[PDB]
Every structure is written in C-alpha cells, then in structure tokens.
Amino acid sequence: STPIQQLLEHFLRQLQRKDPHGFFAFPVTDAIAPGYSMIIKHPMDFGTMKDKIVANEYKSVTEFKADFKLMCDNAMTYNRPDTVYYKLAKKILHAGFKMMS
Amino acid sequence: STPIQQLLEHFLRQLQRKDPHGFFAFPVTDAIAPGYSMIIKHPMDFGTMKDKIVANEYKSVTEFKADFKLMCDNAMTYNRPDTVYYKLAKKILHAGFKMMS
C-alpha cells in the first residue's frame, strides 16, 4: 500500500464524511435521475474514486482532486441550485480543495 | 352557453393542439416531479383551464391569457432548459400569445 495510497485514502474519508446521506457514494443512474446520461458525459462518485485509489490509478494528488471536482461539477450542472443536491456539491467542492491544500 | 365561452373554447382547442403528448393536459404531481409543489406556487394546466371556461370564471380574454402564460411560466421555471417540457412551454407561450390577437 503505497504512500500515495495512504494520503488519498485519508482525503477520501475526510470528503465522504461531509456527505452523511450517500448522495455521492455511488454512480447515479437515469432510472433515479431522469436524462442524467444525456447531460453528464464523464460521470463520477466516491465509490469509483475509492476503487481507483485501491487500483493505484492516481499517480498524484492533482489527479485525485480532478476527480473530486469532476464529481462536484457534474452535480451542480445536473441538479437545480435550490436543491439539497446542488448545494452539498457546491459547498463540498470549495471546502474539499482547501482541506487538500 | 356564452360568446366569451365560445371564444375561449376555440383558443383552448387551438392551444392544446400544440401538445400531442398532452404534457399540459393535467395537474402535475410530486410523484412525477420531485420538489414541484414547493418550487411552483400556483399550478395551471389545460385540463384546469377547460373547467374554468365551462364555469364562466373567465370574464375577459385578458384573464384567460393570464393563466395560459402562468402555465408556460410554471414549466419554464421547473424544468431544466434542455427538456421536452421547457422547450415546449416557451414555444407555445410565444405562439399562443401570437394567436390570441
């Protein structure tokens, strides 16, 4: 388990704790989110980001942070501003980057 | 049986012909649009207008055109800009106002 693997494993638990309901835990589907895959071209979530961590696919902190901002962005785009959903993404996004600095 | 009734009836028929799927045919439920009753404050649909016509509740073309506009403005607020609904709504608002003059 590489040093980069320990840092990211740490950042992940730190982020995923900002999201007590699991909104981000798992890949969204169009069943649960109508027309989702006809707006968001590169989908993301925590559970995917965890699986790449394990897989050693992240060769730096910068690339882990790009997935985070990918998953945050995706949500602000799909969801309306007045939603629980867009608001957690927008909050968690600016905190996240700072925490990881 | 009134003349205002006769005019309203035909603007309705004409307006509704532009809604093949009757997306605007009925009241909207929260079951088919999560958040709806808390983001839209005064519901309107073509089924609901049909009945206010039959009950002489419109007194002027002005009043009737008001509700029509309240229907498109509810769809264009709730639905994302890319959907069949937001599009349909904007189309019919401009064209239906064009028609009634």
Next chain:
Amino acid sequence: GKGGKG
C-alpha cells in the same frame, strides 16, 4: 421522464 432526482 419528467424532472430531477427524488
């Protein structure tokens, strides 16, 4: 086919 997630 209408709306967001809910």
